[PDB]
Structure formats: C-alpha cells, structure tokens
Nucleic acid binder design. Sequence first.
RNA 1: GCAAGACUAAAACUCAAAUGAAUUGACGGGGGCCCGCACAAGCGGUGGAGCAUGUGGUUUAAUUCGAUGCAACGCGAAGAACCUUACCUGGCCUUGACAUACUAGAAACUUUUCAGAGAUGGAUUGGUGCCUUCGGGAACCUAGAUACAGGUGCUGCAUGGCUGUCGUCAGCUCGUGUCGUGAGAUGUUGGGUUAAGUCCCGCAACGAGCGCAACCCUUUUCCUUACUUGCCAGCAUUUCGGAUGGGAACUUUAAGGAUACUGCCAGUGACAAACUGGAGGAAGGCGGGGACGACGUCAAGUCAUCAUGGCCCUUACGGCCAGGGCUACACACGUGCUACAAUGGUCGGUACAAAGGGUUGCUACACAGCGAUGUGAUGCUAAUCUCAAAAAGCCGAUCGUAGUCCGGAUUGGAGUCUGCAACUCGACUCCAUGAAGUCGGAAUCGCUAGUAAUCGCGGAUCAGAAUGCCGCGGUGAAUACGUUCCCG
Lengths: 102, 50, 151, 215, 100
Amino acid sequence: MNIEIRTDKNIHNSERLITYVRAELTQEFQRHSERITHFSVHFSDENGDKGGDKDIHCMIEARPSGLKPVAVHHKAGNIDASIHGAIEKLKRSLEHTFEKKE
Amino acid sequence: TSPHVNKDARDQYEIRTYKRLIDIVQPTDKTVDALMKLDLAAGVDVQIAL
Amino acid sequence: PRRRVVAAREILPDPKFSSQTIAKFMNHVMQDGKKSIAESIVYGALERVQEKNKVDPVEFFETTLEKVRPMVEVKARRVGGATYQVPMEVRPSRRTALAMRWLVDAAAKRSEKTMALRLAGELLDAAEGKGAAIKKREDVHRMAEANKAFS
Amino acid sequence: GQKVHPIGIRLGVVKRHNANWYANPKQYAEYLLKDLQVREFLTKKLKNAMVSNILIERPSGAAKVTISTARPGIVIGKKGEDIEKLQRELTNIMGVPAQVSINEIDRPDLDARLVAEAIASQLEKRVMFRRAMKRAVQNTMRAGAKGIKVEVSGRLGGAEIARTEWYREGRVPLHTLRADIDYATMRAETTYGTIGVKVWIFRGEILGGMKQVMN
Amino acid sequence: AKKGMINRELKREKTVAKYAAKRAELKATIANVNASDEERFEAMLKLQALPRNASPVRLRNRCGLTGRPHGYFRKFGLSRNKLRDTVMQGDVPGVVKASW
RNA sequence: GCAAGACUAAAACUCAAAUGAAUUGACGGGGGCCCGCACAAGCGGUGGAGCAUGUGGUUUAAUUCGAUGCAACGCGAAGAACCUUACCUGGCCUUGACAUACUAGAAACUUUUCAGAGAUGGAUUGGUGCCUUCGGGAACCUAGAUACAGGUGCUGCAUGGCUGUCGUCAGCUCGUGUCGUGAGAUGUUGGGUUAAGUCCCGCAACGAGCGCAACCCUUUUCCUUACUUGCCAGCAUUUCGGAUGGGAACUUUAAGGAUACUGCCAGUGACAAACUGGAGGAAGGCGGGGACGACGUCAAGUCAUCAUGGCCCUUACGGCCAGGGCUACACACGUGCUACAAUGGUCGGUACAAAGGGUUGCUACACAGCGAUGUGAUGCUAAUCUCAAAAAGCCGAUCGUAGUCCGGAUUGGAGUCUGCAACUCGACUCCAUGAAGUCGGAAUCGCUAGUAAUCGCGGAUCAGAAUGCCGCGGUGAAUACGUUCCCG
Ligand SMILES: [Mg+2]
Ligand SMILES: [Mg+2]
Ligand SMILES: [Mg+2]
Ligand SMILES: [Mg+2]
Ligand SMILES: [Mg+2]
Ligand SMILES: [Mg+2]
Ligand SMILES: [Mg+2]
Ligand SMILES: [Mg+2]
Ligand SMILES: [Mg+2]
Ligand SMILES: [Mg+2]
Ligand SMILES: [Mg+2]
Ligand SMILES: [Mg+2]
Ligand SMILES: [Mg+2]
Ligand SMILES: [Mg+2]
Ligand SMILES: [Mg+2]
C-alpha cells in the first residue's frame, strides 16, 4: 500500500519520520496486504506553541480494496503516543469491519 | 466570500444598464424651452442632441 | 429507481429505409454525437452486404438480428453469501439491445480497414452462424442451461 | 450554517439601494470611493445624534445627502450654523457641491441600527448583557414590531471562553423575501476585547412588490 | 497593506504623473520617421535615462480602503473583501445578486 | 468423604465508590417502514506515456507566509522579469515613508547638469503667489524639541466580522394546561398519504415560533405599448448590395399583461386526504434551471483583507535602495491538457450560432513580409464601426495499417512584440530535428436528457504573460426489470 503522511507547521516533519512511519505502519498492518491500497496519516498540534496533556492530534485514514475508506483519530501528548493510539484504533476498526463483512 | 480559502463558495453579482431612445420631430420654440426647463431626477443620465 | 416508471423515448425512423430498428442501430454505432458519420458507416455496410446477395437490406438486417438475439440470462442474486446465478427470461427490448451491442462490439473487434467493412463482415458472419456475437449468444445459453436447476 | 445578508437579499425586491446615481464606467470608481469617504466622515461626526440612514444622490453635477436622525436638533444646530459647516465639508469631500437634508425619526425603537447602538452603549458601560437585551426587546415590541431578535456574541462578562446568546419574540421570517426585515450590526469595545451585537426587526409583509415601493 | 506599501505606491504615482509628458514626447520622437536617426537614438537614450519610477509598468492596483494587492476589480476600485461588504450593505448603486 | 471435594469461617491490605428501578439520547453482524447515481442496467473517464499546475521531501544565501481525510493540494493568488515581495547578499536613515501637539524661517514650486548600482549627496536657473480690522493669516516646505509613530512580529486556544462541513438533511423547540417524588413525558405519538413536522382522520391536549412549500430571477405559448441603429410581407428604383424611395406586416428588441388552477370527464380510496387513465391546450399534475442554509456539530479555517484584548522590537522584528530568490531537482502524491489514429490525418471548395469586450481601446481597406507583424489609413463613446475567421459539419482528391502523410516532447539556427530591462525567467512566428506512446496493475471517479460525450467562441485578473476559473452556443446519445445484497 502507498503511504502518504503529512504534518502541519507546528509538528515539524522530516524524511526520517517518513521512513520510520512507513516501516512501523507496514509492519503492523502487513497481514491485510492486498485488502488495502492506501494509507494517509496526518499530524497536528491544535493549540500550536503551547502545551497540554494531549496537545497533539494524529489521524490515519485507510482505503480498503472494495469497501469505502475508513478513518481514525487520536489525541496524545507526544507524536509516538499519538501514532500508537491511532494504530491500535485502526487495528480494532479494521478487525471489526472485516468480521462484519466476512 | 470566504476570507482565506474556499474557491467554490462565492457570490455572483450583476449590474444592468438600461437604455431608452426618443425622437421629437417638428419641435417648436416653446417645446425646446419646455424640454430644457424640465427638471432631471437622479439615476437617469439624459443626453440631448440637436 | 425506487419509484416512478420512466417512459421510453421515441427514435425517429431512418431516412433511406424508414426503419426505427435501423435508427436505433445507428444510435448504437454513433460516437460523440457524430450521427452523420454513423449513418455513413451503417449505410456503407448495408450496401456492402447487399452486394454479396440480392435481398432486401432491412429484411437481411432483421433476420440476422433475430439470429443473434438471446433467449435466457441469469441475474446474480446475493443470498447466503453466494453468487446464485439464477436463469430468467428477458424482455424484448433487452433482447434487441444486447443483440445490437454484441453485433457492434464484434464488428469493432474485427480486423478490416474500415468500420463499414467490418460491420458488413460481422453481419455476414452472423447470417452464416459463426461470429463473436453468435459465440456470446451460445455462451449465455450454455450458462443459463448449466444453471437451469434453480427457478 | 451561514446566512445571507437580510438587506443584501432584497435589494431589487422590497428595498432600495442606499445610493442612487448613474456613472460611466470610468468615473464609477471615483464616485464610489468618495461616497465611502463621506459616509466614513458622517459616521464619526454624527456619532451622538442617533443617525439611522444616509442616502447619497448625484442628480447632476451636484450632490444630495439625506441624513435620517432621531435628534435633528444637534445636526441642524441651534441657529443653523452646523448645517452650513456640514455642507462645506461635503463640498470639500465631493468635487461638486453637496446639499444636506434631514429626516426626523419619530419611532426610534423601530430602527435596528438605533437599538444596536443603544445596546452597545450599555454593554460598553458594563450593564448585564441579558438585561440590555430584554430591555431592547420589550421596548421594540411595545413600539409595535411584529417581532424582534437580538444576538450578542463575545466574551460576555469577561469570560475566558467566548460565547453567543440570543433572544427572539414575535415573527422573524428571514426566508420570506416579501417581508420587511431591518438588520443591524454594532461593535462594543470593552477592556477584555470586542463584543458583537446583531438586531433583526420585522415590520410585517410588504404587499405589491417593488412597484408598491415605487422604484 | 502596510502604510509603507501605500506610501511607496503614492510616490510611484506621483513620479509617473511628473514624467508622463517627457516620456510621451520621447516616445513620439522615437516613433517619428521624418526625424533623423541620431535624433531617434538620442531620444532612446533619454527615455532609457529617465527615472525608473516614471514608468507606469511599476504600478500595482490596490484596494484603496485596505491596500490589498489581489482581487482588485477595476470597475469598483475595491478588493473583494470590502466589495462584498459594501455591496451587501446596499451602498453600491445598481449592483444586485445574480440568478439566471 | 475412597476421591472429587463439602460444611464452619478470618485478618493484613486496597478503593470512594460499588449498586437497584426508572428518564433523555446515541448504537446494534434486533426488528419492521422509507429515501439518495447508494446498489442494479449503461456511457465516458483517473491509475500507464509527454507536458502544465499545486503540494511533500531534499537543496540553497534565500527557495517568504498560510491551507492538511471526506470537507488541504489549478487552494489565499481574478494572473512573481523590475514593481507585486512579505525572503536573501550588500549599501544606507533614525520624531522616521504616514498623524496630532510646540518654536522659527521660507510661496508652493521651478531649469540644468556632477558623483554613484541606486537609495542619496553637492552644485546651478526662473517665479514670489491667495486673503487681510494689511502691522497678521490660509496652503506647501525647511530646521529643532518631546509625547510618539511603525510591525504581513506571537497568540484563530482571548475575540468581532467572515467562511467550510454534516446538508436543502427534514427536522428543532416554546407558552398554557395535564401526568410523575423527580430526571422528565405529552403536544411532536397511531392509521393512510407527500418531495417534505405536506395534508386528512383519531387522541390531556390546546395553542405558537424557526425550518418545508409560496412570494424573487431566468426559459417555453400568446396580447398591448414602443418603429430606432434593428426588420423587409405588398409596392416601386436599382452601379441587383434593405442599396434606395418607402412600409409598421413578420423576425427582433424591452416594459407591462394573460395563461395552468387536478380546471373538466372515467376510475380508486373511509362516503378524507390523496392517487391512476383521459379531452382540450404551446405547456398537466413540483413544466426545466438559479438564488434562498433551521436549532446545532467539528477550541473546524482566517491575527496575512480588516478591526480588536494581551504580550513583544524601538538606531531595529521600523523605513529607502540595487542585484538575487519565490521558477532549485536523486525522488513521492493530487488535479488537468495532448495523444497512441482510418468513426481518422492532409489539401481545395462550401453552409449554419449564442453570449460578451472596445477612446491610454477595437480597427474596415491598401501596401511589405512565408509568417508572427509593420506602415499608411477608415468608422466607431457603439441594435450604427469593430474584435470576427465560428469549429465540428457537407462535397472532391490523396493517404491504405506503417511508429506511418499518426504523435509533437526535446534540441540547433533566424525573428516579431510588450516593456527602463526578456541571462537567471515572457508570449508568439519561420526553417531543421522527431522523443515516450500502438490503449494503460490492483483499484477507483462523473453522469438519468438537450444530460453525458464531443466541437468551437467570450470575459475578470492584466504593459505582456492560461491547458486554470467564470460564462456562451453547435452536433447529440446509452440505460433503469427492480430495491434482495453496497453504503449514508
Ligand atoms: Mg484549532
Ligand atoms: Mg498593518
Ligand atoms: Mg502589473
Ligand atoms: Mg454500476
Ligand atoms: Mg478544482
Ligand atoms: Mg522580486
Ligand atoms: Mg475556530
Ligand atoms: Mg493553523
Ligand atoms: Mg424555500
Ligand atoms: Mg500567521
Ligand atoms: Mg527588489
Ligand atoms: Mg509559486
Ligand atoms: Mg503530423
Ligand atoms: Mg517506442
Ligand atoms: Mg491579459
């Protein structure tokens, strides 16, 4: 699946982050393989230039071959935490959808 | 209509110009003076040609 | 749709032969609204086929169309998570439409210089009984025959 | 979501423009810019006179400003000297000389702009917002409008979180293009920022269309 | 826009107004056939030696009310942001919403 | 008690809750009932190639700042060579390029050069104006001083104003009553029905408001007014061109009116709403399009249109200038344009539009040029002159399936024009060259009728610079049995 990850001005992005995100996301979602053709993750900081418990928003939206695109959001205090929460939520959502459609 | 970014959200306005033509023939000295004396209301630009 | 019953539009008869069937065939051939070129193609093909054997072009066309029309088709029914292709009869309008589409597509896939020539070749082939449209008719009969068991 | 300007939607239907003149394509921009300048000048000059409308007209090589005021005395002047200065300023602003006319307002509490200024004054003086809102609504309904609506948004009471509160009574059919709806907006500058005020007043349905308006 | 931007625009307009006559005369001399070749060359040199701001090509339209350099709409002289407000207040004569 | 195990029965420690009935929503691989190009039946696309455009990453002195799933990515920008410009290198000013307050001298202005990249600096000409109880004042400069100006610097999570989306989805709520200890409930629920909280019947409800529909614009038929510059049916004259003398018929132009209401007939339904089949009519059951965005949701977007609270810089985070950059290029995405040909390419002839633009402009016509264009010149402030050639189309000839007489990227010479100036970095013209491409993975998009597909024409921005955006007309389809499975 092709991976298209984007951030905002607050978050700060780099090709190193691109490689790491691609690797981790593929490693987690390797089982589905052909079922899914596209991932797009997006990162923001909400109240940019300030702080808080969450203060960062991760999103991941995935296109499954066949059924319609499905999206997931998460809020966390760090980029890694946001990514992990979003990955867990995507895994749960895809498992539920695939069990439903059988 | 949006300050920053919405290309599809717009307002379409129009302005129309209406023109009317009149001729007066065989005019008399009293007719011409009456036409000149007649007052003019705003919003209607009137051109008189001899 | 979920409601209403849309009425069918009227296709005027063709100039030369005054045939609504031939007008509909021209509409199938037509691309990008170039109906004049569509008529040129169809009439050239009809002249070419008439050259081979001296018969009424309209009668030849309708005979070949009857030769190529389908009998029976299946419509996929999704129950119990399976295809369940169920044979069924089809209305005359659908019969004619599929026949015309098959003829035109087979002509398009033939290998002559011009659309008129290859359309005439397809009409001759369908009249003989060996063509791509004949093969699609045979295949649809074969499949609806394999699945006759279900209602 | 968002809503069209109540006046903006009825220009050629039941309302008239606030400017009435003709210009050729070249002098149009100059006329419009100078009209905006004179409106800006008048708004600042007559701040305390409760002015409601300004009608700018260019009949022919001249100008005519009609000012709708609740207090004609202030604008006219005790001995009429103020109007002379006003026309002098208008002629300075506009190339051709301008003449002023005054329209006395005898039912101020039916005018949306006046109500909005009245509420904004109290809000800047730190009266309770929903006290001022109810006072204005009751006064307008006593005046006789078939309906009034008031909206106040911002940091009400100094709150960190801004919010909006509104009150409506009577009828305000915005979607009815044949209805007389007066709309006004005002700003209150308080120590904690800006508060916006919007007023809608409904004066029944106009009959006969623009012809009745005699456009 | 900034007051510096507006003042730069104004000084450019003033310079163009100052030098328009000489610029036009030099261009006419350049385009005059009966004039001598040396005279045409001298006219070209003077036109190239004129101050840069005298050239009208260096002027940018601005809203006037706000000085914004985009969406100018020559006829009204106002950028879209203020033009919409003025129109939908009812202060622009003849302009209405369009539906056709 | 053979065993499995049964009966009797603590404490240490740990939490601020755990619970029962019932009320509002949300949700259900629970249930019925509906709707939507959501499925089904079809037509044409994107994903492959060349180029345009925007973004992400790298790069650089700088590649200025915003927008980020549907709802960011031909988005702010309706148009970056200088300017715009906010960025970088360097040269410069400090009450400042702009406002008010204080003091003093000078009309304002004006002609020439000199130094320099320019900003700036140093010289040098001409005038001495407008009103005055003329002894002083308006304009517009110069010089000094102090509060101050200045900020596209931060915070859209402190705001006003404005905007997106669910979504034109059909819903969302109040007063007086009632019911319940209460949260709350009724009304807004039940039958039919509509596109619809649209309507008719019942009913502790009776009444209202915001939404739905109607009022608004445009198109189809006809009537009155108007006869221009626009029109030519009967007459005549014609260098046969409405050209002319003429006419006010027709087309048209643009204001005002009429018409269509299930109005009438035959059926169905509770004898209700309402729904089918008909006559007449240009048009028959919302005729087709456009504006119009309910209560509310996402600390959704915008401090860079603008305003504004609070923080920050003050010989610089302010101001002026010359060059460079925003156009970079191992790559990755989104939206497009052009093609891969014979339903076609080339050549000759030959018909039919609608909507807009034109005085700092559009330009008939002659010449010069292969051409982009140039010169002379003509009519236009326009139903008058002009942009202007409509193109697909039709008739005739050639091409005869070839990387081609298909395709037109890239490169080498020669030019025109706009502009102070086309090196970075413009549009177009001519000669030469002739690339990938022979129909495009998984996947996925638009569209139900004058629609899709295809063909050309205009405009805002604008000195010049559209394959983008907003409009206009020409030719003109395919298919809907049905809601079973797909989604909201
Ligand atoms: Mg936010
Ligand atoms: Mg500013
Ligand atoms: Mg320019
Ligand atoms: Mg399908
Ligand atoms: Mg787009
Ligand atoms: Mg630049
Ligand atoms: Mg927000
Ligand atoms: Mg942001
Ligand atoms: Mg409506
Ligand atoms: Mg910012
Ligand atoms: Mg520069
Ligand atoms: Mg750019
Ligand atoms: Mg070629
Ligand atoms: Mg090849
Ligand atoms: Mg241009």
